[PDB]
Amino acid sequence: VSLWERFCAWITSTENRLYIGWFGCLMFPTLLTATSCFIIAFIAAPPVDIDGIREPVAGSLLYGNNIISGAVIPSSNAIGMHFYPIWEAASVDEWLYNGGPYQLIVLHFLLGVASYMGREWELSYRLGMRPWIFVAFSAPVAAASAVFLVYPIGQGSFSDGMPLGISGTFNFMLVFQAEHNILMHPFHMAGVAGVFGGSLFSAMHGSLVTSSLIRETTENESTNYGYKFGQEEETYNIVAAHGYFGRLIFQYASFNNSRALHFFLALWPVLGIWLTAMGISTMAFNLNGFNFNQSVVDSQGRVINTWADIINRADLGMEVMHERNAHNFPLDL
Amino acid sequence: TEGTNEWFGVDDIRVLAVLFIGHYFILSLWLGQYGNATEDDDADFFGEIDYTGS
Amino acid sequence: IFTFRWLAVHGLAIPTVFFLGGITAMQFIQR
Amino acid sequence: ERPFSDIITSVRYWIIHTITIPSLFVSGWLFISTGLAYDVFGTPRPNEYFTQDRQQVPLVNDRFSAKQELEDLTKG
Amino acid sequence: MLTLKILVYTTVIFFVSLFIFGFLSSDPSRNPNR
Amino acid sequence: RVPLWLVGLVGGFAVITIVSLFIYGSYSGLGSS
Amino acid sequence: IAGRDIESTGFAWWSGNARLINVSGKLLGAHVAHAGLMVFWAGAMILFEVSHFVPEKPLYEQGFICMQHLATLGYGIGPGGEITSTVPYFAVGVIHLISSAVLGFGGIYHSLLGPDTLEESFPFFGYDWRDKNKMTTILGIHLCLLGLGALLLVAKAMYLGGVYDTWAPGGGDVRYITTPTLNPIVIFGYVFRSPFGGDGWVVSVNNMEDLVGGHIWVGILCIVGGVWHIFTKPFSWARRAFVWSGEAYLSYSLAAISLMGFTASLYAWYNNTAYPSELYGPTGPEASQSQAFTFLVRDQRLGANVSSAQGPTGLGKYLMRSPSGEIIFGGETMRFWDLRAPWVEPLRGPNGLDINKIKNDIQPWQERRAAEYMTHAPLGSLNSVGGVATEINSVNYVSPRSWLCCSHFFLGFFFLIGHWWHSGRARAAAAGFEKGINRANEPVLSMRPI
Amino acid sequence: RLPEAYVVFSPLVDVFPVIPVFFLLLAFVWQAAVGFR
Amino acid sequence: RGLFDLVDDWLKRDRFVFVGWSGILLFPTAYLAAGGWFTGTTFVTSWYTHGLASSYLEGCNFLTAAVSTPANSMGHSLLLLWGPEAQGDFTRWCQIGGLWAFIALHGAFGLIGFCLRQFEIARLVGIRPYNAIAFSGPIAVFVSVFLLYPLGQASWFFAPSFGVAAIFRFLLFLQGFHNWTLNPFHMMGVAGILGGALLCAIHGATVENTLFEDGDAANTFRAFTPTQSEETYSMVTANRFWSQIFGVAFSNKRWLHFFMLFVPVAGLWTSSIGIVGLALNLRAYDFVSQELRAAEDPEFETFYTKNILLNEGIRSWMAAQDQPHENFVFPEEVLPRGNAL
Ligand code: CLA
Ligand SMILES: CC1=C(/C=C/C(C)=C/C=C/C(C)=C/C=C/C=C(C)/C=C/C=C(C)/C=C/C2=C(C)CCCC2(C)C)C(C)(C)CCC1
Ligand SMILES: CC1=C(/C=C/C(C)=C/C=C/C(C)=C/C=C/C=C(C)/C=C/C=C(C)/C=C/C2=C(C)CCCC2(C)C)C(C)(C)CCC1
Ligand SMILES: CC1=C(/C=C/C(C)=C/C=C\C(C)=C\C=C\C=C(C)\C=C\C=C(C)\C=C\C2=C(C)CCCC2(C)C)C(C)(C)CCC1
Ligand code: OEX
Ligand SMILES: [Cl-]
Ligand SMILES: [Fe+2]
Incomplete structure (x- = not known):
């Protein structure tokens, strides 16, 4: 045989501790470089001028932060959507002043997660499985891409992306609420229903399966020891569990098929997350949620308020105080 | 620079040379095993996946 | 005539029709 | 018994x-x-939110005298 | 700065070529039902 | 003896006309700005 | 009946259109019927938009997405972007509506009455999903048709009336493009450009000559490729890398169409040459630049010298410098300094905005355009309110740019999901384990322990 | 407004654009007619 | 035998719906709570307590109608129909806000009855009662917020209102006044909820993508007899796949399902503690060190201070209309505001 054939046989081998595959060639370097840069920048980075008004903001541990308030600041507003690699700065100090590491981390990270999906499919193929797990994983990837890349593209600046921090996430959420009126977009309601229903069904399924265990342990050992690796037993007792579910609610509602059950379980949260990601992506292009301000009037013509007006007051309060020194003109276009 | 529109970001000869070096090195390694292919009408197949050895 | 299902379904159904009629009537009110 | 599937059919x-x-x-x-x-x-009518005398919102300020306060606020 | 760009381009093209020529080496045949 | 694919059609017509009436009332009348 | 039940094919009713994979007679009828539906919608939408036209408001204040394309092609538009007549739109709608009937009848016939398979009486119109020569032939034929279409667009742009040009010397007007650019360096620098800010990849075309030259080159390439793929068969390096089945081809098409949808949405959002602002409305950056220009003009008229006015941060209230040196508008709109519009270029010199021209060379029409674009920014809500999120119900307007961008972005993402699903299934079925794990010979049980 | 010779047909024109959806609903109706064979 | 035995035999018979002894507590209270919400969102107003319109009869839609809390002048009254505030007179009872108390009070007992019903059915069929600890989670959430939060505050007026937009108002209100996102208990609740959603999706795709070939048609749904002895999917293949992709994987089928049960309930029970803490204004608002440094050094800035400024803006611009009974009057010159807008 040749050298290339041996290399290919080693790459696609299903006997290593961790599968490599051809997608792993793009996966591993990008994720590793993103991790290294993120750790170093989170620990020891200097303040970054995020808004382009020459007012740097500290975000690293060594400059007086804690775990909660630390972050990696997005790039400067003066840059916009321009590409800013290291070799385009006159010095490393200038590169760090304008928020260089954010772009590097984000780009290598997104490439890494795409390769992660590909690698999942590849191992599924090599193991003789059915190839539909990476489709399920595509939803968190879609949401992360939506925020990190799509929102800056629509708004025209990397500085509007979500900061890589804990309190930066809250700041992003609050400003997004103030500017786009989320919580009134039906796609956000779809996402909330998705997560709540996912938690509900996880708890219900766990309870039902755990309650229907046959007797193999008696008292003085954890019940988990009954199951053996490779044992043959369907994940319930049909009589007890089916009767319990058919008696708890009306008898017409009971899943007697494991396939349909475990399909519904997979389908619900994935669809919810897809819809909420598309909601964020569409709101990136200034298509906001429902507007119900001053919609109820009496006979004379005066305005009677509703709860939407209280929400509007909160939105105005958030809006008038964000980026205090950044605006010069009456409209925030 | 940043705002200019050069192809693939190439602004110097050395960048092009090293790109050629990379594609060509991996290409030579690949040709070390797939370089003896023929287009004769007996190496073809009738199916969805090519199992005809090399 | 007095089964449990009768009582449940009618107790859930009569006010539903009443309220739906009320809402449809509300739809044509103008100030 | 006599399920809905043929209850829906009885003339x-x-x-x-x-x-x-x-x-x-x-x-x-x-x-x-x-x-x-x-x-x-007690829902106000579209021409009853504000009367000729009271031109502000009629909020209740007392606990044990809510009856008299509401009677005043409605018409009197 | 120029040398850093040279090295980064080298690494990127190397890994991308690895990917491209790896998927061209009769990949659909590498399944357990061969 | 209605078959079990026409009564569902009647129910669908009823629900769709109710929803359409509610949307129209949303666009016209009380609470329409 | 055979071929239309689960017991004979699997494929329960909710996935019944998958029973047509190996039936080449009904598939033709299905595809023709969908084409007829598309033509019908085009004609009906044109007619509906024509019926509601009002000659006072601009086209972007009436919620139209179909009249703008015909207007850009040079039908019924005059100087400055005013609509003069609507007869050609009526003619286009009528022709589409009439052709839809023929297409639908053909689909219905070929689907409900014609032979189930064409591989027994019409050998020319037959295939096997695995005969590579036939697939290449079909691809080449329809590719040559695409090239002919591109050349037809070029011919319309050059000889048959002309196209609307928003950069015309004296305001937008219909003119003949007599000198298209043909130097391959420019076109293939457009193709091989980076997509980030300042470059924009192919969205950044900013004149009609480049557009016509590009469509010329595309026509030439498509014709040549069609002939080549007709007269040849796939080479060795391609045979060992692809999967040869119908679902694989479907997934291949799905990925490309998703990419095209993304590209079109970004065209609609950012470009203002093929989507002139007089018809679709101002772009995102354009409204902010207009606001800055309007307030600069007002403050200068009041008496200020707007070159040395200091802002709250000391950076410059009206004018400043971009990170490369050019003079740009101040404020939060420093991110949109890449904008180029026909109503701003009169004030731009060799190094950005010109101080003297700004001082004493601003015409009232520019002021009016700036005010209009400032007050008609692309911001709105789902129920068509218009304005910032904290505004009250007074106007009813959402720009067509937002609608087009959001819709085709949604479609692009879901068709990418299509690539993933249909391709994974195609490859798994080709390998032979899409039904499940063979319990007799589970492959995992014969691997070295980990 | 449509050309004067066709203004009478305006109500039909106001309904054409939505026809392509009724087709999608008709597919489900046809499937339900044969009892989801 | 006696009356007790006959009634007990009748109550546990196999019917369309199980009734049981707990049905007496469950059915009336739940029915009354649902009916109260349905009539409140349709006919009753909030004009005299909040100064708002909150019914269909006034012009609201599904997303803006609610059953609002009672007036602030009635601190923690039980608001009985025959109490010293309404003294009968259904109309005055509706006008002062008795429907909210009606709904909450009968609904708490409805929840208790549902938990008792779960216990009873589990005992009847002879299985361990694990679906009654999983429901205790949501019981803790409801009790904690809807009862303990108002009881520590001034009055019932500061409770969530039964509506869609009222809940959004509640969220924004707690963020603005308590800095609720910074509390380390909502954090653990978020972690629990998101982990539950993740677990639900990964299992159904893992189970659905390791099925044994037990059929001949592409529709794998009709390849499962209602219950057999063999498992429908391969545990070994799933273990291998997930241990080679992620580096760690499950191997015990009981631990998997117990983990699925455990995560979200733990999240909810954790968030309840933080809400109970907020009830007494014992919040996690300030980092004193950063406040001191920012006061001394007028160049130190993090995202923390920006969030603080946002909260100040929320409070100042919302309090005037959110609490109409305080007669707040803020001149335009005292409202905090940035430049331009
Ligand atoms: C664009 C949409 C579209 C198209 C073109 C088709 C086309 C087709 N489907 Mg299909 N399908 C669709 C959507 C579509 N489907 C959807 C959404 C579903 C899910 C509910 C299905 C579910 C489905 C199943 C389950 C099956 C098909 C089958 C078929 C094929 C035979 C149908 C047949 O025998 O008709 C029989 C129907 C009739 C005789 C009644 C309809 C008569 C006409 C068409 C009504 C319309 C006439 C029109 C209004 C008047 C035009 C006049 C003109 C002169 C202008 C055919 C190629 C079958 C197949 O594979 O066959 C091998 C099959 O088993 N489909
Ligand atoms: C018209 C026009 C224009 C344009 C022009 C042109 C010329 C274009 C071109 C275009 C083009 C020219 C495109 C192309 C593309 C390509 C592609 C898109 C490719 C892809 C690839 C692939 C897909 C592959 C894959 C793979 C791999 C990776 C390896 C192995 C495996 C496989 C094979 C799968 C302009 C702008 C000037 C102006 C306007 C008008
Ligand atoms: C409070 C009170 C009370 C009680 C009452 C009651 C009990 C009532 C009931 C009531 C009721 C019980 C009512 C109900 C109503 C209902 C309704 C109103 C419904 C509606 C519906 C709808 C509208 C739906 C919708 C929908 C959906 C959701 C989905 C699908 C689609 C549709 C559209 C169908 C009494 C007497 C004790 C006295 C004291 C006070
Ligand atoms: C153009 C034109 C026209 C028209 C025509 C057309 C083309 C039509 C046809 C077509 C159509 C337009 C048809 C449609 C129909 C549809 C329907 C009406 C459906 C219904 C639906 C439903 C009701 C459904 C339901 C259901 C069922 C049954 C079962 C399952 C579930 C569901 C819910 C889905 C005319 C004559 C005027 C003449 C002039 C021109
Ligand atoms: O960068 Mn971030 O936050 Ca979107 O609004 Mn305008 O720009 Mn600024 O202000 Mn508001
Ligand atoms: Cl600004
Ligand atoms: Fe399991």
Whole structure:
């Protein structure tokens, strides 16, 4: 045989501790470089001028932060959507002043997660499985891409992306609420229903399966020891569990098929997350949620308020105080 | 620079040379095993996946 | 005539029709 | 027994329902259109939010004298 | 700065070529039902 | 003896006309700005 | 009946259109019927938009997405972007509506009455999903048709009336493009450009000559490729890398169409040459630049010298410098300094905005355009309110740019999901384990322990 | 407004654009007619 | 035998719906709570307590109607129909806000009855009662917020209102006044909820993508007899796949399902503690060190201070209309505001 054939046989081998595959060639370097840069920048980075008004903001541990308030600041507003690699700065100090590491981390990270999906499919193929797990994983990837890349593209600046921090996430959420009126977009309601229903069904399924265990342990050992690796037993007792579910609610509602059950379980949260990601992506292009301000009037013509007006007051309060020194003109276009 | 529109970001000869070096090195390694292919009408197949050895 | 299902379904159904009629009537009110 | 799948078919079911349901629907319509709900529940009418004397919102300020306060605020 | 760009381009093209020529080496045949 | 694919059609017509009426009332009348 | 039940093919009713994979007679009818539906919608939408036209408001204040394309092609538009007549739109709608009937009848016939398979009486119109020569032939034929279409667009742009040009010397007007650019360096620098800010990849075309030259080159390339793929068969390096089945081809098409949808949405959002602003409305950056220009003009008229006015941060209230040196508008709109519009270029010199021209060379029409674009920014809500999120119900307007961008972005993402699903299934079925794990010979049980 | 010779047909024109959806609903109706064979 | 035995035999018979002894507590209270919400969102107003319109009869839609809390002048009254505030007079009872108390009070007992029903059915069929600890989670959430939060505050007026937009108002209100996102208990609740959603999706795709070939048609749904002895999917293949992709994987089928049960309930029970803490204004608002440094050094800035400024803006611009009974009057010159807008 040749050298290339041996290399290919080693790459696609299903006997290593961790599968490599051809997608792993793009996966591993990008994720590793993103991790290294993120750790170093989170620990020891200097303040970054995020808004382009020459007012740097500290975000690293060594400059007086804690775990909660630390972050990696997005790039400067003066840059916009321009590409800013290291070799385009006159010095490393200038590169760090304008928020260089954010772009590097984000780009290598997104490439890494795409390769992660590909690698999942590849191992599924090599193991003789059915190839539909990476489709399920595509939803968190879609949401992360939506925020990190799509929102800056629509708004025209990397500085509007979500900061890589804990309190930066809250700041992003609050400003997004103030500017786009989320919580009134039906796609956000779809996402909330998705997560709540996912938690509900996880708890219900766990309870039902755990309650229907046959007797193999008696008292003085954890019940988990009954199951053996490779044992043959369907994940319930049909009589007890089916009767319990058919008696708890009306008898017409009971899943007697494991396939349909475990399909519904997979389908619900994935669809919810897809819809909420598309909601964020569409709101990136200034298509906001429902507007119900001053919609109820009496006979004379005066305005009677509703709860939407209280929400509007909160939105105005958030809006008038964000980026205090950044605006010069009456409209925030 | 940043705002200019050069192809693939190439602004110097050395960048092009090293790109050629990379594609060509991996290409030579690949040709070390797939370089003896023929287009004769007996190496073809009738199916969805090519199992005809090399 | 007095089964449990009768009582449940009618107790859930009569006010539903009443309220739906009320809402449809509300739809044509103008100030 | 006698499930819904063939309950939906019985002709007597259909005829008694056609006799009964429209009466309830019209009763609800008349309940709204007569204006009786405004008096039962105390909801102000579209021309009753502000009276000629009171031009502000009528908030209740006392616990044990809510009856007299509401009687004042409504019309008096 | 120029040398850093040279090295980064080298690494990127190397890994991308690895990917491209790896998927061209009769990949659909590498399944357990061969 | 209605078959079990026409009564569902009647129910669908009823629900769709109710929803359409509610949307129209949303666009016209009380609470329409 | 055979071929239309689960017991004979699997494929329960909710996935019944998958029973047509190996039936080449009904598939033709299905595809023709969908084409007829598309033509019908085009004609009906044109007619509906024509019926509601009002000659006072601009086209972007009436919620139209179909009249703008015909107007850009040079039908019924005059100087400055005013609509003069609507007869050609009526003619286009009528022709589409009439052709839809023929297409639908053909689909219905070929689907309900014609032979189930064409591989027994019409050998020319037959295939096997695995005969590579036939697939290449079909691809080449329809590719040559695409090239002919591109050349037809070029011919319309050059000889048959001309196209609307928003950069015309004296305001937008219909003119003949007599000198298209043909130097391959420019076109293939457009193709091989980076997509980030300042470059924009192919969205950044900013004149009609480049557009016509590009469509010329595309026509030439498509014709040549069609002939080549007709007269040849796939080479060795391609045979060992692809999967040869119908679902694989479907997934291949799905990925490309998703990419095209993304590209079109970004065209609609950012470009203002093929989507002139007089018809679709101002772009995102354009409204902010207009606001800055309007307030600069007002403050200068009041008496200020707007070159040395200091802002709250000391950076410059009206004018400043971009990170490369050019003079740009101040404020939060420093991110949109890449904008180029026909109503701003009169004030731009060799190094950005010109101080003297700004001082004493601003015409009233520019002021009016700036005010209009400032007050008609692309911001709105789902129920068509218009304005910032904290505004009250007074106007009813959402720009067509937002609608087009959001819709085709949604479609692009879901068709990418299509690539993933249909391709994974195609490859798994080709390998032979899409039904499940063979319990007799589970492959995992014969691997070295980990 | 449509050309004067066709203004009478305006109500039909106001309904054409939505026809392509009724087709999608008709597919489900046809499937339900044969009892989801 | 006696009356007790006959009634007990009748109550546990196999019917369309199980009734049981707990049905007496469950059915009336739940029915009354649902009916109260349905009539409140349709006919009753909030004009005299909040100064708002919150019914269909006034012009609201599904997303803006609610059953609002009672007036602030009635601190923690039980608001009985025959109490010293209404003294009968259904109309005055509706006008002062008795429907909210009606709904909450009968609904708490409805929840208790549902938990008792779960216990009873589990005992009847002879299985361990694990679906009654999983429901205790949501019981803790409801009790904690809807009862303990108002009881520590001034009055019932500061409770969530039964509506869609009222809940959004509640969220924004707690963020603005308590800095609720910074509390380390909502954090653990978020972690629990998101982990539950993740677990639900990964299992159904893992189970659905390791099925044994037990059929001949592409529709794998009709390849499962209602219950057999063999498992429908391969545990070994799933273990291998997930241990070679992620580096760690499950191997015990009981631990998997117990983990699925455990995560979200733990999240909810954790968030309840933080809400109970907020009830007494014992919040996690300030980092004193950063406040001191920012006061001394007028160049130190993090995202923390920006969030603080946002909260100040929320409070100042919302309090005037959110609490109409305080007669707040803020001149335009005292409202905090940035430049331009
Ligand atoms: C664009 C949409 C579209 C199209 C073109 C088709 C086309 C087709 N489907 Mg299909 N399908 C669709 C959507 C579509 N489907 C959807 C959404 C579903 C899910 C509900 C299905 C579910 C489905 C199943 C389950 C099956 C098909 C089958 C078929 C094929 C035979 C149908 C047949 O025998 O008709 C029989 C129907 C009739 C005789 C009644 C309809 C008569 C006409 C068409 C009504 C319309 C006439 C029109 C209004 C008047 C035009 C006049 C003109 C002169 C202008 C055919 C190629 C079958 C197949 O594979 O066959 C091998 C099959 O088993 N489909
Ligand atoms: C018209 C026009 C224009 C344009 C022009 C042109 C010329 C274009 C071109 C275009 C083009 C020219 C495109 C191309 C593309 C390509 C592609 C898109 C490719 C892809 C690839 C692939 C897909 C592959 C894959 C793979 C791999 C990776 C390896 C192995 C495996 C496989 C094979 C799968 C302009 C702008 C000037 C102006 C306007 C008008
Ligand atoms: C409070 C009170 C009370 C009680 C009352 C009651 C009990 C009532 C009931 C009531 C009721 C019980 C009512 C109900 C109503 C209902 C309704 C109103 C419904 C509606 C519906 C709808 C509208 C739906 C919708 C939908 C959905 C959701 C989905 C699908 C689609 C549709 C559209 C169908 C009494 C007497 C004790 C006295 C004291 C006070
Ligand atoms: C153009 C034109 C026209 C028209 C025509 C057309 C083309 C039409 C046809 C077509 C159509 C337009 C048809 C449609 C129909 C549809 C329907 C009406 C459907 C219904 C639906 C439903 C009701 C459904 C339901 C259901 C069922 C049954 C079962 C399952 C579930 C569901 C819910 C889905 C005319 C004559 C005027 C003449 C002039 C021109
Ligand atoms: O960068 Mn971030 O936050 Ca979107 O609004 Mn305008 O720009 Mn600024 O202000 Mn508001
Ligand atoms: Cl600004
Ligand atoms: Fe399991």
